[PDB]
Design a protein around this motif. Structure first.
Motif, PDB file in Angstrom:
ATOM      1  N   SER A   1       1.311  -1.219   0.243  1.00 48.17           N
ATOM      2  CA  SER A   1      -0.290   0.268  -0.184  1.00 48.17           C
ATOM      3  C   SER A   1       0.711   1.091  -0.005  1.00 48.17           C
ATOM      4  CB  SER A   1      -0.661   0.401   0.915  1.00 48.17           C
ATOM      5  OG  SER A   1      -1.451   1.191   1.436  1.00 48.17           O
ATOM      6  N   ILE A   2       0.152   2.100  -1.205  1.00 50.61           N
ATOM      7  CA  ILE A   2       1.685   3.754  -0.488  1.00 50.61           C
ATOM      8  C   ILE A   2       0.479   4.330  -0.670  1.00 50.61           C
ATOM      9  CG2 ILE A   2       3.372   2.639  -2.182  1.00 50.61           C
ATOM     10  CD1 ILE A   2       1.915   4.062  -4.924  1.00 50.61           C
ATOM     11  N   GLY A   3       0.509   5.349  -0.327  1.00 52.66           N
ATOM     12  CA  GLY A   3      -0.454   7.263   0.050  1.00 52.66           C
ATOM     13  C   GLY A   3       0.282   7.984   1.029  1.00 52.66           C
ATOM     14  N   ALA A   4      -0.864   8.266   1.458  1.00 51.26           N
ATOM     15  CA  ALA A   4      -1.419   9.012   2.590  1.00 51.26           C
ATOM     16  C   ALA A   4      -2.021   7.856   3.691  1.00 51.26           C
ATOM     17  CB  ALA A   4      -2.267  10.483   2.567  1.00 51.26           C
ATOM     18  N   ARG A   5      -1.797   8.114   4.610  1.00 48.46           N
ATOM     19  CA  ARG A   5      -2.132   7.350   5.791  1.00 48.46           C
ATOM     20  C   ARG A   5      -2.084   5.864   5.151  1.00 48.46           C
ATOM     21  NH1 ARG A   5      -7.547  10.317   8.880  1.00 48.46           N
ATOM     22  NH2 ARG A   5      -6.836   8.462  10.084  1.00 48.46           N
ATOM     23  N   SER A   6      -1.304   5.518   4.447  1.00 53.89           N
ATOM     24  CA  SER A   6      -1.450   4.276   3.844  1.00 53.89           C
ATOM     25  C   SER A   6      -0.551   3.148   5.254  1.00 53.89           C
ATOM     26  CB  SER A   6       0.140   3.754   2.477  1.00 53.89           C
ATOM     27  OG  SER A   6       1.262   3.651   3.726  1.00 53.89           O
ATOM     28  N   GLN A   7       0.188   3.585   6.489  1.00 54.80           N
ATOM     29  CA  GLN A   7       0.357   3.093   6.816  1.00 54.80           C
ATOM     30  C   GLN A   7      -1.047   1.690   7.936  1.00 54.80           C
ATOM     31  OE1 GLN A   7       3.568   1.361   8.605  1.00 54.80           O
ATOM     32  NE2 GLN A   7       4.335   3.540   7.082  1.00 54.80           N
ATOM     33  N   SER A   8      -1.157   2.838   7.829  1.00 60.20           N
ATOM     34  CA  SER A   8      -2.780   2.470   8.628  1.00 60.20           C
ATOM     35  C   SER A   8      -3.523   0.785   8.087  1.00 60.20           C
ATOM     36  CB  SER A   8      -3.923   2.642   8.489  1.00 60.20           C
ATOM     37  OG  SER A   8      -3.739   4.120   9.326  1.00 60.20           O
ATOM     38  N   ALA A   9      -3.543   0.343   6.357  1.00 66.03           N
ATOM     39  CA  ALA A   9      -3.479   0.058   5.912  1.00 66.03           C
ATOM     40  C   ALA A   9      -2.315  -1.517   5.970  1.00 66.03           C
ATOM     41  CB  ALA A   9      -3.628   0.443   4.355  1.00 66.03           C
ATOM     42  N   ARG A  10      -1.329  -0.891   6.109  1.00 67.11           N
ATOM     43  CA  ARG A  10      -0.123  -1.516   5.712  1.00 67.11           C
ATOM     44  C   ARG A  10      -0.661  -2.670   7.115  1.00 67.11           C
ATOM     45  NH1 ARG A  10       4.939   1.723   4.244  1.00 67.11           N
ATOM     46  NH2 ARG A  10       4.504   1.424   2.037  1.00 67.11           N
ATOM     47  N   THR A  11      -0.663  -2.025   7.749  1.00 70.21           N
ATOM     48  CA  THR A  11      -0.216  -3.439   9.483  1.00 70.21           C
ATOM     49  C   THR A  11      -2.102  -3.932   9.422  1.00 70.21           C
ATOM     50  OG1 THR A  11      -2.566  -2.016  10.907  1.00 70.21           O
ATOM     51  CG2 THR A  11       0.025  -1.733  10.976  1.00 70.21           C
ATOM     52  N   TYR A  12      -3.180  -3.864   8.703  1.00 65.01           N
ATOM     53  CA  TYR A  12      -3.979  -4.413   8.234  1.00 65.01           C
ATOM     54  C   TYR A  12      -3.653  -5.471   6.798  1.00 65.01           C
ATOM     55  CZ  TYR A  12      -8.902  -7.184   7.072  1.00 65.01           C
ATOM     56  OH  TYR A  12      -9.422  -6.874   6.762  1.00 65.01           O
ATOM     57  N   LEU A  13      -2.775  -5.062   6.474  1.00 62.84           N
ATOM     58  CA  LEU A  13      -2.385  -6.082   4.917  1.00 62.84           C
ATOM     59  C   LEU A  13      -1.242  -6.283   6.099  1.00 62.84           C
ATOM     60  CD1 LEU A  13      -1.949  -3.962   2.316  1.00 62.84           C
ATOM     61  CD2 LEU A  13      -3.402  -5.760   2.851  1.00 62.84           C
ATOM     62  N   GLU A  14      -0.503  -7.219   6.623  1.00 62.55           N
ATOM     63  CA  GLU A  14       0.215  -7.307   7.590  1.00 62.55           C
ATOM     64  C   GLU A  14      -0.202  -8.744   9.029  1.00 62.55           C
ATOM     65  OE1 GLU A  14       4.119  -6.527   8.526  1.00 62.55           O
ATOM     66  OE2 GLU A  14       4.025  -6.248  10.404  1.00 62.55           O
ATOM     67  N   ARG A  15      -1.330  -8.326   9.347  1.00 62.96           N
ATOM     68  CA  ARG A  15      -2.018  -9.766  10.286  1.00 62.96           C
ATOM     69  C   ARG A  15      -2.962 -10.056   9.294  1.00 62.96           C
ATOM     70  NH1 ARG A  15      -4.245  -5.289  14.294  1.00 62.96           N
ATOM     71  NH2 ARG A  15      -5.088  -4.127  12.450  1.00 62.96           N
ATOM     72  N   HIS A  16      -3.230 -10.291   8.091  1.00 61.03           N
ATOM     73  CA  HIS A  16      -3.668 -11.025   7.977  1.00 61.03           C
ATOM     74  C   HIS A  16      -3.152 -11.618   5.924  1.00 61.03           C
ATOM     75  CE1 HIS A  16      -6.324  -8.811   9.631  1.00 61.03           C
ATOM     76  NE2 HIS A  16      -7.471  -9.389   9.516  1.00 61.03           N
ATOM     77  N   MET A  17      -1.711 -11.784   6.605  1.00 55.15           N
ATOM     78  CA  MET A  17      -1.003 -11.891   4.709  1.00 55.15           C
ATOM     79  C   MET A  17      -0.915 -13.564   4.508  1.00 55.15           C
ATOM     80  SD  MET A  17       2.778 -11.267   6.024  1.00 55.15           S
ATOM     81  CE  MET A  17       2.948 -12.797   5.063  1.00 55.15           C
ATOM     82  N   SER A  18      -1.511 -13.617   5.803  1.00 53.45           N
ATOM     83  CA  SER A  18      -1.762 -15.557   5.360  1.00 53.45           C
ATOM     84  C   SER A  18      -2.982 -15.864   5.056  1.00 53.45           C
ATOM     85  CB  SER A  18      -1.443 -16.095   7.105  1.00 53.45           C
ATOM     86  OG  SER A  18      -2.262 -15.894   7.656  1.00 53.45           O
ATOM     87  N   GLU A  19      -4.087 -15.547   4.745  1.00 50.97           N
ATOM     88  CA  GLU A  19      -5.694 -15.809   4.881  1.00 50.97           C
ATOM     89  C   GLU A  19      -5.667 -15.499   3.304  1.00 50.97           C
ATOM     90  OE1 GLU A  19      -7.972 -13.285   7.061  1.00 50.97           O
ATOM     91  OE2 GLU A  19      -7.041 -13.655   8.253  1.00 50.97           O
TER      92      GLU A  19
END
Ligand SMILES: Nc1ncnc2c1ncn2[C@@H]1O[C@H](COP(=O)(O)OP(=O)(O)OP(=O)(O)O)[C@@H](O)[C@H]1O
Ligand SMILES: [Mg+2]
Lengths: 73, 238, 213, 243, 96, 241, 233, 48, 234
Positions: free
Chosen positions: B157-175
């Motif tokens: 994820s890039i752009g603004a307030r992307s960090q909030s996404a990067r964590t969501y994506l890092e908890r579900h990267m297995s699924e």
């Protein structure tokens, strides 16, 4: 996490994320963040720090000019 | 403060300021997510409007029939790097009669954005890309920066307030590896819904979805092609 | 000393109905007196309602196909739609003319549905000029086929006859005949035959067998 | 070579080079231009002569074409470089289109030559302003004025250069259709306007008229002294409305 | 700990500041203070203080007892255009 | 003052400051070690994973510059991929005109000489990138060169580059290596990496390894998966003990 | 690699001076003394040779070069900039000789060499040359002595000095120069006016002399100079 | 923080000390300080 | 104190481009309203004397018989863009033979917006960004459309935009008076009401230019006569 303990923070806060959010910050700036979060919770009218306050503190204690043309994404 | 006026000067600390800055042009841009599966790659982008009477600027640009991109930065630079890729993939059809495999495309963007970070008085391209392509190695995502690096990702994820996404994506990267197509886009939206303020939500007039798969040439969905994905979407409670 | 062309035969043909566009060509690709291969359609689908038929020097068919098939994509990215038949015909003219001093050697028959939903056929020469027609044959047997369409489809030199439009059924069986009759007298027509019907529902392809002599 | 950017944007949103070239105009000489119905009169104030110079090489009213003349105020150096390219243009147009240049068109090309110079590498702006004056293919009079920016408007009357803010203030009240009804009244309007910003009388105003389909005549000094006598005679017969 | 930038005011600000300085002097009925703010580019608060002074001056110079709509457009011309030739804001604005 | 704004300016000291700074941008990157034995060369990169979001074993720092020449880089990675293409391009013009795989002694001197041309003018910026070229031939043995921003090349028996340049050069000095078969070195490399890495300054790491020697018949590959695991097991054991 | 700068470094100052040429003339005045004396049948160009040990080989370089069969140079100032001008002169002479089949007159050669030095006060990204050339030559029956300056100007002299203490030497020459000298003093008187600015003992390998008579320019062999150094010849 | 020091200690924070004002000349850096200078009603010590 | 023409602000965007935006706030006012009946463009001339001809001022220019334009900012810099637009639309007509979509023209004009470059280009490239914002309004196969194009190369479709020295003020009064169900006669009257507040002198038949572009017509600028008729109603 060392300067938060003095105050009431929700369990919402996620220090893992904030740390990655800041960059080039000193111990003096990280310190200032918590200061600023608490200052945004004082204005809003609550008594807990949520994860959203820290996010707006980072935007505040981070040097950043008033760039109101940042609408070219 | 004197090491900030060229890409050509190094800083005593061992960085280059003009390349650091350019990357702040990306964090001004509008949030955008990209994740993959093992059969689909998806680009979910949060468009934006600068008024009430105004349309939203297109975040997803179609490149070839198996490559999409999602810009974030100066748009004038994003269409300068998009014409060069369109031109690289018409060079491959025309010489080899095959699709240009994405890994070798991102390596040309890499050779062309490197150059002007080392010549006098030229600047870096102020735009970050997410490149969703599918060839003979399954799906790929590629994040490009104005520094000229790039990465093979499994979900970026890039752009603004992307960090909030990067964590969501890092908890579900297995699924992600086991999703059907419609289940994946749900993740992307749920990640992109964490980049907004808490007061508003994803509508059909500011979301753009781009899907590329094994049997599906890269498409784009807008307005009312996006409704079959917001409908069914979980509610995000505070 | 060196001769940059050779004549590789091939016969192309096209009829514009009233909601359908035929484009039909043999497949025999021959050079000189040998038969190089027996299958090699002269028909390339461009859009969903546009076939083009190249015939002549086969080195230039391949180039001129990939050039159009590229400036077809290129157009789509900038305008966000596909090209109409009416446009491709104009564009192809410029391309051809671009090489006015070492020209292509390709006879082109474009056939598709323009906007209204009617048959349209465009005929090019080598150096790039075109009118719109209702049927044109080209290539090698162009002189065999052009009079049997003037008669059946054009009703020219006849009197006391109907003029009821051209049926999708009378066309295909018309094509299949004129090609069976050009394979007797012309030596560059044979082996197989792609008929491309282009209705408003896509593009079918029908394969028929000619005489392999 | 010498690929630099001379003209860049201010932070205030100006262009300081094209605004500084505006001052090289103001240090020029006054020139006015009024258009009649059959006659267009532009006069440049100051011949600049020192009883030693020729009046044949200090002229500031050149002639691009046959129906097109042009007066300027700024750096004499630059003006000669524009005027040249303008004269070339005025013949390049007779070759490719049979008619002669109209007065709009030779202007749009002088302006567009000055605009490109404030947006190309290496170059400073042209430091001139111009009154392009002429008659079309229809006998119509025209008066155009450019500036370093490379913008141009038509006028009915106008003054450029030094003391031009004052002369525009005199032409607002005096340009009517009780004046410029005859060839004698239109020449007297121009002279009466430069006499407000020349501090040495009439023997210091070079003045050129153009008349319908004939070519540019520069009025010799004798005719101008005759017209200056009619002005000064007319400010003593305004003593019949003060009594 | 906190850095406060004082950027040049925008349109909306200017309109506000004209009221803060002009309200104190006698002005004819209908002054479009919102038009004196479209008519200002990026102006300092202290440029607008100066405008109001000169609108007062032309009223004083001509012996009238009230500044009119004309007097501002005229004094706004004098104080901005002319004097802007030698302004701080252009150059001093990058060190900011 | 004004002795750092240009590569074209000596300082009063006697040294070009813009090249000094470049070399310090290398020192702030992860560590890469090379170690030449008697029948091959083995490469070792200490690639940090900065998120769990980057795909595994991807965006390498181990290029193939030619079909028998490794290139392991450290420093600013963008400029690295730029050199890796200039080198491929040289080692193609050399096979074109002279008709045989380019000798690594020469490919080095040519890639250094190209880096050097970038510290002379003010119109360009010196590369922020030190890197090692390995190679094996049966007519020249293994050779290992190392280039840096200055534009200096030096033969080596081992070396390292990056943020742990000091700690790793020790481990190789305390190692015999003119006597070990290729197969035995790879175990050493893994063990050295694990020692020189700090997990109290970095998160975790992926261990990248490359043959080029007698094993593979003068080609250059990446070590096969099975031998890579064996080298990670023998490396956790020397940190236990 | 690069493009090159495009903007001149020699610029006018508020004075009306070209500061760069003013300085490059001060480099000239640091250089080794050189005298020039037109005779009445030859020209003498003598110069204080440079050395500062006994390790230097005082026959591997020459401060008195031949430009043509009938031309000569010495210089005063930076030694690298002298090998550049000697080499652009020798080529000028060869283009002239290739078109007219005639040795280039000495008025001509100085007027062209000067226009090369003038090009480096108005070209992009260069500094002026750091030398003054003293050009002798003997064409058309006469001798000639010129001198071009890093400015680009050039002046014909009847005898002059340049380099260090060139104000003491122009005075010393002003008296001792009475026309109608023989060629052999100009040597003598030249060597004397090097001595009015030279500290130490002159030898055959420590100065360099060149003459230039109708027979053509020639550097004087070490033996030859040792004899004029009888301080009586 | 000088008029109501009770609400910063009940939350448990400590407000920030210094404040930098910067802007183009004549934009109220001093004016905005002439302002706080009187209304504050607490000891005020400005050095030039 | 000098920097390049291509410097990024540590903030995050290009010095010049952020500046060239300020050069717009000096320019006249333009208002474009997009309807189902057509597009209208209204722009005030802003004459400075009574001696100027209120006719040699052109701030609406035809690009083709179905694509209008309105300039605000430095009208001198538009001369280069407008002429690239025309030669774009014509070339697209000379090859593909058919009109050009309005969006495509504005894209082709925006590719010049970022093109300055003090060096490493031709001895002919721009040195500074263009100082001008445009309102391309045309009618093609999507019906009417109106695009706004600023010196950042970012173009975007609008239902109604205002630019110039009354971008702030007018934009807010468009949001209250605009809605999908309009006709062209309602819009031309709506805009001239907004344009009458934000001008400085009285609204004559010599102080605006109107144009319209309608499905069943060409680009058609209103003359001095036809203007009298819609200012009578107000
Ligand atoms: N926002 C504002 N509201 C009202 N007046 C203002 C404003 N900004 C500036 N001014 C006017 O500008 C005048 C001077 O401003 P001030 O001296 O505070 O600017 P400054 O930032 O101190 O500049 P300097 O750097 O020259 O000291 C004030 O007296 C005031 O009238
Ligand atoms: Mg102050």
């Amino acid at each position: 996490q060392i300067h938060s303990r003095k105050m009431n923070v929700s369990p919402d806060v996620n220090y893992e994320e904030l740390a990655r959010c800041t960059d080039d910050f000193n111990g003096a700036q990280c310190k200032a963040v918590c200061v600023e979060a608490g200052m945004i919770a004082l204005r809003r009218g609550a008594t807990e720090l949520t994860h959203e306050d820290y996010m707006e503190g980072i935007l505040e204690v981070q040097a950043k000019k008033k760039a109101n043309l940042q609408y070219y994404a | 403060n004197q090491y900030d006026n060229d890409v050509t000067v190094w800083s005593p600390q061992g960085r280059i300021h003009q390349i650091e800055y350019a990357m702040e042009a990306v964090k001004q841009g509008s949030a955008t997510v990209g994740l993959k599966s093992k059969t689909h790659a998806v680009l979910v982008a949060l468009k934006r409007a600068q008024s009430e009477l105004a349309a939203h600027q297109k975040k997803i640009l179609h490149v070839d029939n198996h490559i999409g991109i999602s810009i974030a930065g100066l748009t004038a630079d994003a269409r300068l790097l998009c014409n060069f890729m369109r031109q690289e993939c018409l060079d491959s059809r025309f010489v080899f009669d095959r699709p240009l495999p994405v890994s070798r495309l991102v390596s040309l963007i890499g050779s062309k954005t490197q150059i002007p970070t080392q010549r006098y008085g030229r600047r870096p391209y102020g735009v970050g890309l997410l490149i969703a392509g599918y060839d003979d190695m399954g799906p790929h995502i590629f994040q490009t920066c104005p520094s000229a690096n790039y990465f093979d990702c499994r979900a970026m994820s890039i752009g603004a307030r992307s960090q909030s996404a990067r964590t969501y994506l890092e908890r579900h990267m297995s699924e992600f590896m086991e999703c059907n197509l419609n289940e994946l886009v749900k993740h992307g939206l749920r990640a992109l819904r964490e980049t907004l303020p808490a007061e508003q939500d994803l509508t059909t007039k500011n979301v753009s979805i781009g899907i590329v798969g094994k049997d599906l040439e890269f498409t784009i969905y807008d307005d009312d092609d996006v409704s079959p994905f917001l409908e069914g979407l979980e509610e995000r409670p505070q | 000393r060196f001769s940059p062309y050779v004549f590789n035969g091939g016969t192309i043909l096209a009829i514009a109905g009233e909601d359908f566009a035929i484009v039909a060509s043999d497949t025999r690709l021959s050079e000189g007196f040998s038969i190089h291969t027996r299958d090699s359609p002269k028909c390339y689908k461009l859009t969903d309602k546009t076939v083009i038929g190249c015939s002549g020097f086969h080195g230039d068919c391949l180039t001129l196909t990939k050039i159009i098939e590229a400036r077809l994509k290129m157009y789509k990215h900038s305008n966000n739609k596909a090209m109409t038949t009416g446009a491709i015909a104009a564009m192809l003219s410029t391309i051809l003319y671009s090489r006015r001093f070492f020209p292509y050697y390709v006879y082109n028959i474009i056939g598709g549905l323009d906007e209204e939903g009617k048959g349209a056929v465009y005929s090019f020469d080598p150096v790039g000029s075109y009118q719109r027609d209702s049927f044109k044959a080209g290539g090698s047997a162009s002189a065999m086929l052009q009079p049997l369409l003037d008669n059946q489809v054009g009703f020219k030199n006849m009197q006391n006859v109907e003029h009821v439009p051209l049926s999708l059924d009378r066309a295909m069986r018309l094509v299949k005949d004129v090609f069976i009759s050009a394979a007797e007298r012309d030596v560059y027509t044979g082996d197989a035959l792609r008929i491309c019907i282009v209705t408003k529902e896509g593009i079918r392809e029908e394969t028929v067998s000619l005489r392999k002599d | 070579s010498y690929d630099r950017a001379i003209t860049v944007f201010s932070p205030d949103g100006h262009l300081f080079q094209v605004e500084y070239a505006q001052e090289a105009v103001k240090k020029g000489s006054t020139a006015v231009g009024v258009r009649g119905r059959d006659i267009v009169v532009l006069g440049v104030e100051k011949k600049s002569v020192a009883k030693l110079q020729d009046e044949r090489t200090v002229r500031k009213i050149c002639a691009l074409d046959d129906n097109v003349c042009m007066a300027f105020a700024g750096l004499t150096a630059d003006a000669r470089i524009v005027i040249n390219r303008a004269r070339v243009e005025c013949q390049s147009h007779r070759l490719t289109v049979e008619d002669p240049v109209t007065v709009e068109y030779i202007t749009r090309y002088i302006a567009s030559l000055k605009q490109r110079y404030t947006q190309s590498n290496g170059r400073r702006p042209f430091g001139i302003s111009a009154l392009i004056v002429g008659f079309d293919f229809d006998g119509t009079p025209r008066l155009y004025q450019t500036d370093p920016s490379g913008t141009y408007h038509a006028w009915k009357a106008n003054a450029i250069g030094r003391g031009a803010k004052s002369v525009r203030e005199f032409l607002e009240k005096n340009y009517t259709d009780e004046a410029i009804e005859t060839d004698d009244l239109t020449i007297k309007l121009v002279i009466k306007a430069l006499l407000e910003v020349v501090q040495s009388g009439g023997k210091n105003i070079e003045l050129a008229v153009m008349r319908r389909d004939q070519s540019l005549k520069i009025l010799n000094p004798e005719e101008i002294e005759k017209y200056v006598a009619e002005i000064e005679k007319e400010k003593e017969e305004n003593e019949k409305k003060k009594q | 700990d906190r850095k406060i930038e004082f950027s040049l005011p925008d349109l909306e600000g200017r309109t506000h500041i004209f009221k803060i300085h002009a309200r104190s002097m006698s002005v004819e009925r209908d002054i479009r203070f919102e038009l004196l703010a479209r008519l200002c580019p990026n102006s300092t608060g202290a440029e607008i203080r100066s405008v109001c002074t000169e609108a007062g001056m032309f009223a004083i110079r001509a012996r009238r007892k009230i500044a009119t709509e004309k007097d501002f457009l005229e004094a706004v011309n004098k104080v901005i255009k002319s004097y802007a030739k030698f302004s701080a804001t252009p150059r001093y604005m990058t060190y900011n | 003052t004004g002795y750092d704004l240009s590569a074209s300016t000596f300082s009063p000291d006697g040294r070009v400051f813009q090249v000094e700074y470049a070399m310090k941008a290398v020192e702030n990157s992860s560590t890469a070690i090379g170690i030449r034995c008697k029948d091959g060369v083995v490469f070792g990169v200490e690639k940090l994973v900065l998120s769990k979001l980057y795909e595994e074993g991807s965006n390498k720092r181990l290029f193939n510059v030619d079909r028998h020449v490794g290139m392991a880089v450290a420093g600013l990675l963008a400029d690295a991929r730029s050199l890796a293409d200039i080198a491929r391009e040289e080692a193609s013009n050399f096979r074109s005109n002279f008709g045989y795989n380019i000798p690594l002694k020469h490919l080095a001197d040519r890639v250094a000489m190209y880096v050097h041309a970038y510290t002379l003018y003010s119109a360009v910026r010196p590369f922020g990138c030190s890197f090692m070229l390995g190679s094996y031939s049966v007519n020249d043995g293994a050779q290992l060169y190392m280039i840096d921003p200055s534009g200096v090349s030096y033969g080596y028996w081992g070396c390292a580059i990056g943020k742990a340049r000091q700690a790793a050069k020790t481990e190789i000095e305390k190692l015999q290596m003119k006597e070990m078969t290729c197969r035995d070195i790879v175990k050493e490399v893994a063990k050295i990496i694990y020692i020189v890495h700090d997990e109290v300054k970095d998160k975790a790491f992926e261990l990248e390894l490359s043959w080029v020697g007698e094993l593979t018949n003068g080609r250059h590959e990446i070590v096969p998966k099975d031998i890579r695991e064996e080298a990670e097991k023998y490396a956790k054991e020397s940190l236990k003990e | 690699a690069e493009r090159g700068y495009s903007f001149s470094l020699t610029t006018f100052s508020p004075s009306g001076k070209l500061v760069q040429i003013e300085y490059a003339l001060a480099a000239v005045a640091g250089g080794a003394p050189s005298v020039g004396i037109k005779a009445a049948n030859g020209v003498v160009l003598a110069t204080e040779k440079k050395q500062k040990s006994i390790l230097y080989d005082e026959r591997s370089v020459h401060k008195v070069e031949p430009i043509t069969k009938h031309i000569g140079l010495v210089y005063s100032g930076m030694g690298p900039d002298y090998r550049v001008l000697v080499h652009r002169a020798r080529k000028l002479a060869q283009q002239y000789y290739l078109v007219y089949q005639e040795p280039i007159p000495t008025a001509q050669l100085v007027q062209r060499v000067a226009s090369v030095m003038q090009e480096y006060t108005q070209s992009g990204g260069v500094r002026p040359f750091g030398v003054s050339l003293l050009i002798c030559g003997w064409n058309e029956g006469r001798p000639y002595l010129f001198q071009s300056d890093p400015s680009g100007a050039y002046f014909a002299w009847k005898a002059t000095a340049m380099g260090k203490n060139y104000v003491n030497g122009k005075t010393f020459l002003e008296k001792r120069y009475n026309e109608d000298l023989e060629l052999e003093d100009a040597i003598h008187t030249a060597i004397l006016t090097l001595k009015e600015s030279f500290e130490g003992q002159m030898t055959e390998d420590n100065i360099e002399v060149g003459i230039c008579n109708e027979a053509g320019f020639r550097r004087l062999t070490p033996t030859e100079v040792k004899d004029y150094l009888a301080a009586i010849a | 923080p000088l008029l109501h020091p009770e609400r910063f200690v009940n939350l448990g924070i400590e407000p920030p000390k210094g404040v930098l004002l910067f802007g183009p000349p004549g934009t109220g850096k001093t004016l905005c300080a002439r302002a706080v200078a009187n209304r504050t009603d607490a000891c005020f010590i400005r050095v030039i | 104190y000098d920097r390049g023409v291509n410097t990024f602000s540590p903030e995050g965007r290009l010095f010049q481009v952020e500046y060239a935006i300020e050069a717009i706030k000096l320019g006249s006012t333009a208002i474009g309203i997009q309807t189902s009946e057509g597009v209208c463009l209204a722009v005030e001339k802003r004459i400075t004397s009574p001696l100027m001809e209120p006719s040699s001022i052109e701030k609406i220019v035809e690009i083709d018989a179905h694509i209008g334009c309105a300039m605000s900012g430095l009208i001198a810099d538009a001369k280069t863009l407008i002429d690239k637009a025309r030669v774009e639309t014509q070339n697209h007509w000379f090859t593909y033979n058919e009109t050009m979509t309005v969006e495509s023209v504005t894209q082709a004009v925006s590719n010049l917006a970022l093109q300055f470059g003090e060096e490493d280009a031709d001895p002919g490239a721009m040195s500074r960004p263009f100082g001008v914002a445009l309102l391309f309004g045309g009618v093609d196969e999507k019906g009417p459309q109106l695009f706004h194009m600023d010196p950042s190369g970012t173009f975007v479709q609008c239902d109604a935009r205002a630019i110039g020295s009354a971008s702030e003020g007018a934009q807010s009064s468009l949001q209250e008076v605009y809605h999908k169900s309009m006709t062209l006669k309602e819009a031309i009257k709506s805009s001239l009401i907004i344009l009458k507040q934000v001008m400085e002198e009285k609204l004559n038949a010599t102080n605006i230019e109107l144009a319209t572009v309608q499905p069943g017509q060409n680009f058609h600028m209103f003359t001095k006569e036809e203007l009298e008729e819609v200012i009578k109603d107000i």
